Each structure stands twice: as structure tokens, then as C-alpha cells.
Amino acid sequence: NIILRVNEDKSFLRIKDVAKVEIGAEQYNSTGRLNTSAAVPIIINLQSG
């Protein structure tokens, strides 16, 4: 719904008219597999000492 501009006819231009907004991950680059099954891998590092 965000209005980019008025358009000289009181009919607002909108982000929807020029784009497709959706919720989605910032980086789709990496995935994780556990025994051939999707999973997210959380690595726990040990603190020093």
C-alpha cells in the first residue's frame, strides 16, 4: 500500500503496482541436512576456559 506518488489524477501509484511484496528469508543461499532431511544446523562454540 505504500504510496510512491500522486499521479496527477488523485489516483495514487503504489508499491503494489510495481512490485510483489512477500515475507521471505534474507539469504536463501544455505540449507542444512540431517540424515537426508531438511533441518537448521545450530553450532554451539565452546567459550575459552
Binding site: 521471505g24 539469504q27 536463501y28 543461499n29
Partner: protein, 50 residues
Amino acid sequence: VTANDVINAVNDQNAQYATGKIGEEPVVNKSPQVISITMQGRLQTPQEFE
């Protein structure tokens, strides 16, 4: 030309880099190769400055 005009020019024509990517993960085609994009504007030579 005022000095202010000149300061602005240098600030724009001599600029830092911007990186993009080609054929990344969101695309549906799933291009076999993912090539990075490099944009540079840094000026190193005195002549380039002039």
C-alpha cells in the same frame, strides 16, 4: 563554477564500490553458474581526477 560545485563533483565521480550478484538463489531458473557483479568508481590517477 563555485568551489562547492567542485567538492560535490569529486564526491560523486570518485566513489566507493557496489556489489550485486547474477543468477542467485531466489530466481526460479536456477542458473548453474552464479557470477558476482563488481562496480567501481575509484579514481587512482592524477589525470582521472582532472
